Structures are given as structure tokens and as C-alpha cells.
């Protein structure tokens, strides 16, 4: 009775919604955090961008849930002498959600613990060495579960989110075509639960705060889908 | 490189950018222009609605110009001892484009003149009697192309509109599923002389304006779809 | 709980069931009727081009019918002291059905009456002059309903059908792009009635009978979609 | 230029091409292996079940090279007292391939060594303990790339393949919806290179040869897409 669904090789600014640093490079890049004119990624850098509708994820009255589906391809880059930091993440959270906190909280979250609040759904890849993984947020930034994420810098790396309401089971899975390398996290969501009937999907990212704890964060392709019966 | 599309048989103010009359009511229907606590549609009213987020209709850089689809089901009934007018029609307008003149201009033009500057095209199901009729509309409320409309008061329409940037064929047609009428217009529109890179997509309606020319204008669901860079799997 | 999909701007053998005439040229086009080596439409053709998989248009059990469209862009030219003859339909039929007759039956029917068992289904586009028409067929070549055609020869011309299982209406509109004409017909069909569970989708065309009657019957681009509740 | 895409949440015959002990049972369950009517899989076994109409995944002509996407739910269960073998696989096959050897071999090879002319990409869900794994098959059981899987009987398994022509990286992975649990791999494939310019897709898989090594393989729901010259709107 609802579908929505959008793709983009190359981003611009005409329908999406950029939060903070987020930018559209003039080659159509998503950069979600900032990169000097030098081409230097920048410390305590938090961008999000989501699309410009609303999707809507479940229905009070049906009681229906919203299944969906998300891939996009990043690179995360590390200057030499660096370390990466922190991350990004795909997120759905509540229409006019604004940025939250940033460095290891990733603009998601405003702290440690569980907020039933926070109406958030994440799928965050940590960059930050628990060794660096790709964690399943549930109104926090401690990953109901994570898995162990090998990263490697400058390495273009796609990701798919799915979340199927049937079994509530989000997963979350990452590969990096260049190196072959591929990881994958699934647990279970009660979005009914956790988010609101409406959402804005999109994306989040941060650098390290400290020096030597920086990434680039860049979305170079989006892909979004969402069916609510 | 681009795709975009969506799909509602029930509609909700929050995905919707709603202008003037047009509402969403408690059983999500879209009301495109006013309807009394009385049920009664009222005169000299205008509403539209567009899909909340733009569209990318071309890019200069490569020239790629979107082909783009949209269906919809629609309403219009007329209070008895009434006539209709004066019709809605489905629209793609710049981004932040705002509803123009009532009644017979229908929220889409200012004059009955030529405007290259309204970057407006349109697919106007014209209730007002030159026999009702659905035109396309490029820049002028004079369609480019007419066919007659055999309008029936209280029934539901459905409408596609379809659009092919390789022939620029505009294409729409109209049928009332319960009495199995049908209605077709296309000509070429060169979208990329006419609407700028990105639009928005949707619905404008209007009532008449004298005693006994008014209608409901009612969206009961809509469908759009867009690639920059298949019907079928549209509709 | 079903769903089907494909589309090519090229036809290739692989994927298609030919009947008859029917080929995919050099060019990929899909001949529903023949051509010689000279380049003449030749009498007397009929060709009909199914896609390989079925579709299930309703399940008996839950009573649900499925709703399903197709577009396919067509060009039907006439050699000069000819008139054009007989036309192309696009079909739904049981699944392993084979072509009917000839001429003005379209490889449909084999009568002009109305005949439950056809099972059938059609769009015709009927190039034989009661004016040249595209004709909504449920079980007779005999249109339930008919709308004038202002047929134009070598003109590509796209199609557009659909059917709605909810309203039970189908719609059949014929558009040439370089002319600017169109065409619409609409009419109620009970598929659940009429057709198998499971179908076949594609089209028949065919050639006059008699010299001077004759046309291609090509179809360039065919796209389908059906879903089943 | 070509797209193919279906999903099925109930198996029907009409449709599939089944091969060897691959049934569709009354509750519509793709049952890839069999199952005897005292409800216990039995050993030596092989099916496999493939979508009717065949992908194109290539044309020398343009050299464009498909990209492709196929989900399914699988169930694999053990009766007591017994291990679990050997697997089942999803397949790019040419047109018309038909099974091969039981057991390790999963109905896709006849040897252990690599065969150029398999003409065979697969995603191997080997339950045959080198720990229970799903491995990338191209041209060789001896898959170029495996990973851990901690298969468990009787709980549904939702895979996930994906191949995308420009990086030729295929990626497979299985999630078990109730225990929560997942895995992954992924390695490039030059498809264009091994696979035909048309493939079948579907399904295969084996149950052990000796005594106490046997499982059911039951595919409950399958999509499957395919573009030749979009993940999200596929899942
Ligand atoms: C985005 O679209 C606008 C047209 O509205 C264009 O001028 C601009 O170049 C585009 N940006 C990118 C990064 O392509
Ligand atoms: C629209 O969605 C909101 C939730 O944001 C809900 O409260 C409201 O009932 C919906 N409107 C309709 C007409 O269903
Ligand atoms: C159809 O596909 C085959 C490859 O199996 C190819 O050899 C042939 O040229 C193709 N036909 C057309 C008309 O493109
Ligand atoms: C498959 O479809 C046929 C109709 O062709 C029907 O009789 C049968 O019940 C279906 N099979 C299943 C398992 O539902
Ligand atoms: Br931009
Ligand atoms: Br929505
Ligand atoms: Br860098
Ligand atoms: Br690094
Ligand atoms: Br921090
Ligand atoms: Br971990
Ligand atoms: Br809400
Ligand atoms: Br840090
Ligand atoms: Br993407
Ligand atoms: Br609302
Ligand atoms: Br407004
Ligand atoms: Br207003
Ligand atoms: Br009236
Ligand atoms: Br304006
Ligand atoms: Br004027
Ligand atoms: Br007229
Ligand atoms: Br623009
Ligand atoms: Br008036
Ligand atoms: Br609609
Ligand atoms: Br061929
Ligand atoms: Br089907
Ligand atoms: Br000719
Ligand atoms: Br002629
Ligand atoms: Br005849
Ligand atoms: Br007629
Ligand atoms: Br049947
Ligand atoms: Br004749
Ligand atoms: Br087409
Ligand atoms: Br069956
Ligand atoms: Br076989
Ligand atoms: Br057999
Ligand atoms: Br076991
Ligand atoms: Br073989
Ligand atoms: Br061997
Ligand atoms: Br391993
Ligand atoms: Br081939
Ligand atoms: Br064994
Ligand atoms: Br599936």
C-alpha cells in the first residue's frame, strides 16, 4: 500500500537533505565529512544526508511494518601517518531528525546506553580499534551486535542494510571489491518498537577527534527501497 | 544514474509538499481542492499536491533528458442541480513552484497567453464547457493538444501519464473504471526547452467560479516514477 | 506472494518462445510475421513470441488474481499499392498454448464468436478496414469493445496494456511518437472466468490473406510485469 | 537493454525447472533433496531447481557483462542422531545444464579438480565437516574462496547473492533469522570469462552418502534480478 525507492550514482544536492559537512562534491560525490581544498579529510567532521521524503516504516492502524533495503558504496581513505576514525553509518531515524554527537557516537546517538527515545536504527562501521567491526545500532551506539571488520583504507567498500519485518532481523553486510574482503552482521529489530511510523533514511559519519584519527567519509553511489503493507 | 519512484494508495500529509485546498483526509484520500463539513465541493477553490521530494528531469553536462511515468485514480463529483468545473491536472514544475490562477487556468498559468518562462508541463483534465477535454499543456493553459473528455460526475479515474525523453512523447490518458470510458492525448514536448534540470511532481485542481460550476477534486492514489541516464513494471 | 518481470530492447531467441513467423532479425527485432530477403512483408504470416517463464494470473485456493502490464513499441509498415492487414495483439494465454488461425483471427481464435475455452485474452491492434481499431478481446476476436485507429504505416508505434485485478478493467492505448496520434480502449474483464491460474504473455501477429494486404509486424521493445497477491 | 526479475514465496512447478529429487510439496516448499513421507531426509541425494527463462549475463557484441541479485529462505534439517550432509548451492549455470555428482560434489562438478569448461559459478552451502562453510564455486568444488558457516538444522536460512559485472566481485551471504546468526564471502568472478552469454539460475544440493549424514534442503522463497547493459529494490 506504500513503496518508496531511489538510486543514485551520482549525488546532488536537489533531493537530498545535507545535514552538517555533508557535501556534494562537484564530481557528484557524497562527501559525508569534510576534505580540505589541500584533499585533506578533517578531524571532528560529522555529516549526515538523508532523501528529501519521508518513507513511512509502519502503520498504528494495520499494525503493518515496513520492510527495507539500502546500498551504497563508500570510501573511507587514511592519509599515511593516520589512523582511520570513526566511521559512518545508514540510518533511519524520525523525520526532522537533526545530528547528534560526534566522533564515536557518529551523529546518532548522545550517549552509551540504551534511550528507547532515540528512535534510531543504525548500522554503523566502526573504524575505530574491540577490533574495528560493523555494528547493528538499536537506539544506541553499543551494537546489540557486532562482527570484526578488517578495514582498509582508500578501498571503495559497498554495503547492503537490509530489514525484513516479518522476522525483524536487520543485516548489515560490507565488501571491498578491490581486496575481496566481505563481512556481515544480522540481529533482530522490532522497528514497531523502536521507530516511528515515519523516517528519514540516509547517512551519518565522523572522524576521529584526535590527530591521527581521520577518514574520509565519502557515499560515492545510494541506493534506498522501503514496502509498507 | 538516476531512479526515483513511489507509490501510494493511501495518502498522508508527510511525504506529500500540499498547496492551498488540497488536503489529506481521515480515510487518506487527497482532497485536491475543498469539500465541506456538509460533503458539498465549494466554489473558486484550488489545491495541489506534489511528491515531497524533486525529480531529475535532465542534465546539461551529458544531455540526458528522464523519461518519467505517473498514474493516479481520481474523483470528481458534482452536487446535483450543479455543473462541473473546472477540472485538475497532473503537473511537473520547477522546484518550489506555487500554485497559479483558479478556475479555468486551473493553479497552472497566470493568462490565456504563451509563456516560455512557465517551464510548466501539465496534463489538464478540463471539466468546464469547446468540449471538456484532457490537454497538454507546454507553457500555456492553450493545450498544445486536446481530446474530448466525456466527464462523468462521481466517478473514479484513472489516469497515466507517461513521458519518453528519447521520442518526447507526452502521453496521458484517462479512464473511468466503472463505466469503462477511456481517453487519450500525446504530443512531443521538449521537456529540456521547457522545465528546468529538476522537478517536482503532482496534482492541481480547481472548482468553478460562478453558482453551479463546482466539483470535487479527489486523488484517491498515485504512483510516480523517473529514470535519468519502463512503464510496465510502473504500473 | 508473486511477482514477474523483464525487459529488452533487443530480443534474442534464448528467453522466447517463437511460435511460427515469428524471429528475432540480426537487429533483434522480434518479426512477429515474415519478411524476405528482399525486404516484402509477405502474406498470409503468422508469428506469436511468448516469454519462456509463466505467469500465474490467480491462485484458485486464495482467490486472489493477479494485475499485470506491458508495453512493447511495434512498427507495422506497408509496402506502397498495399493496405495493411491484419494486425498484432499482444496475448495472454495458457501456458503451452499454440497458435490459433490466420487473417483476421490473429493466431487467436479460431471463430468470431464468443468461446469460454479460448481463455484468452488480447489487445489487437486491427490494421483490416467498421474502422481500423485497437479491440479489448476476452474470449472472441469479436471485441467487447472497440475504438478507431487512424493506422499509419512505418510509424513505430508504442503500446501500453494493462489490467487491473481490483476493478477488472483493462486498458489498451497504441501512441505514435513521430505522428503524435493516440488511442485508448477500455473494458471490464473477469480473468478469474476466463484465464488459467497460469499464463503465457506475448503477442500474434498477422499478414492479409489477400495481395495488397499485407504489413510488417515488428515488435523493437517488450516489457512485462504481472503480480499476484 | 535486458532486465529479468521474479519472487516467489510459494514454489510452483509451472515456472521452475526441477531437476532430479527437487519437488515443490503441497505448502509450495521448493524441496530440493528428498524427504520420505515419514518426514526424514534420505541419503544420496540431489535436486536442483532453476527459473524457467533464461538470464542473459552477457553480449560479446558490446561486451557488457550482467550484474545480478538472488535471495532465498532455505531450510536444512537433521533427523536425530544424525550429521548434517552435504549442502545445497545457488547456480549460474549454461542453459540447460543438468546435475552432477552427489554428495561433496553438490550436483555442480564431477571431480575435485578445476574444469574450465564447468562453465559453473556457484554459492556452495557445504554441510560436510575443515568446518561447515559457504564458498564461492567458479569452475571447481575446490571453492576459491570459503568462509565458517556454523550451520544449525531445521532453522530457516535467508541467503543473499549478489554480482556486480563492473567489479566482478560476487558476494554470498546467509543469515539463520531465528538464532540471528550470519556469514559471508565474496571474491571476484570474471563471469564473462567462465559463464556462457546466457545462464539458468537456481538451485542445487546433495544429502551425505553414509549413514547419519543427511539433511533436507528446502528452499521456501526465492528472487532473483538480473541487468544487462540495484540491489536495495530487489531485497
Ligand atoms: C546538481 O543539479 C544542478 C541542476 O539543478 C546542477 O547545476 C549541478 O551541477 C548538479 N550537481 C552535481 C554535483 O552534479
Ligand atoms: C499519516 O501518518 C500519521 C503518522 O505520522 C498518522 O498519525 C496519520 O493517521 C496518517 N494519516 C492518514 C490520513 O492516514
Ligand atoms: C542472442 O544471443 C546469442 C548468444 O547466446 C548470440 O550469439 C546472438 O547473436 C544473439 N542474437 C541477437 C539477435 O542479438
Ligand atoms: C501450482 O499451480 C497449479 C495450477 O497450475 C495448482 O493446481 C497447484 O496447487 C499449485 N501448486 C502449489 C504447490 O501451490
Ligand atoms: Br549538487
Ligand atoms: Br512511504
Ligand atoms: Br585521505
Ligand atoms: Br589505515
Ligand atoms: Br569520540
Ligand atoms: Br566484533
Ligand atoms: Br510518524
Ligand atoms: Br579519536
Ligand atoms: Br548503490
Ligand atoms: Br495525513
Ligand atoms: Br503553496
Ligand atoms: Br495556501
Ligand atoms: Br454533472
Ligand atoms: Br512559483
Ligand atoms: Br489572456
Ligand atoms: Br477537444
Ligand atoms: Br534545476
Ligand atoms: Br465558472
Ligand atoms: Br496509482
Ligand atoms: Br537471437
Ligand atoms: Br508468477
Ligand atoms: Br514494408
Ligand atoms: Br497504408
Ligand atoms: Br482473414
Ligand atoms: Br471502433
Ligand atoms: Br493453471
Ligand atoms: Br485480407
Ligand atoms: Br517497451
Ligand atoms: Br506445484
Ligand atoms: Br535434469
Ligand atoms: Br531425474
Ligand atoms: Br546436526
Ligand atoms: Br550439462
Ligand atoms: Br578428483
Ligand atoms: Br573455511
Ligand atoms: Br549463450
Ligand atoms: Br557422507
Ligand atoms: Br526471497
Redesign the interface.
Known amino acids: 500500500?506504500?513503496?518508496?525507492?531511489?538510486?543514485?550514482?551520482?549525488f546532488?544536492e536537489?533531493?537530498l537533505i545535507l545535514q552538517r559537512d555533508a557535501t556534494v562534491s562537484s564530481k557528484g560525490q557524497l562527501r559525508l565529512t569534510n576534505v580540505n581544498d589541500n584533499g585533506e579529510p578533517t578531524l571532528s567532521s560529522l555529516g549526515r544526508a538523508f532523501?528529501?521524503?519521508?518513507?513511512?516504516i509502519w502503520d498504528n492502524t494495520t499494525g503493518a511494518v515496513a520492510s527495507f533495503?539500502?546500498?551504497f558504496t563508500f570510501n573511507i581513505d587514511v592519509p599515511n601517518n593516520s589512523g582511520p576514525a570513526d566511521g559512518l553509518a545508514f540510518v533511519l531515524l524520525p523525520?526532522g531528525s537533526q545530528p547528534k554527537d560526534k566522533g564515536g557516537l557518529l551523529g546518532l546517538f548522545n550517549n552509551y546506553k540504551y534511550d528507547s527515545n532515540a528512535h534510531t536504527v543504525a548500522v554503523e562501521f566502526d573504524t575505530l580499534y574491540k577490533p574495528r567491526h560493523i555494528g547493528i545500532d538499536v537506539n544506541s551506539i553499543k551494537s546489540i551486535?557486532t562482527?570484526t571488520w578488517d578495514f582498509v583504507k582508500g578501498e571503495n567498500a559497498?554495503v547492503?542494510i537490509?530489514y525484513?519485518s516479518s522476522?525483524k532481523?536487520l543485516?548489515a553486510?560490507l565488501?571491498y571489491?578491490?581486496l575481496?574482503?566481505?563481512?556481515?552482521?544480522?540481529?533482530?529489530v522490532d522497528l514497531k518498537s523502536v521507530l516511528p511510523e515515519?523516517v528519514i533514511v540516509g547517512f551519518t559519519a565522523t572522524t576521529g577527534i584526535t590527530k591521527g584519527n581521520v577518514e574520509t567519509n565519502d557515499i560515492l553511489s545510494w541506493?534506498?527501497?522501503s514496502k509498507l503493507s
Chains 1, 3 share one sequence.
Open positions: 500500500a506504500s513503496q518508496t525507492s531511489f538510486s543514485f550514482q551520482r546532488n536537489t533531493n532523501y528529501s521524503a519521508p518513507i513511512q533495503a539500502t546500498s523525520v551486535k562482527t559497498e547492503l537490509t525484513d522476522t532481523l543485516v553486510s565488501v571489491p578491490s575481496k574482503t566481505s563481512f556481515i552482521v544480522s540481529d533482530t515515519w541506493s534506498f527501497a
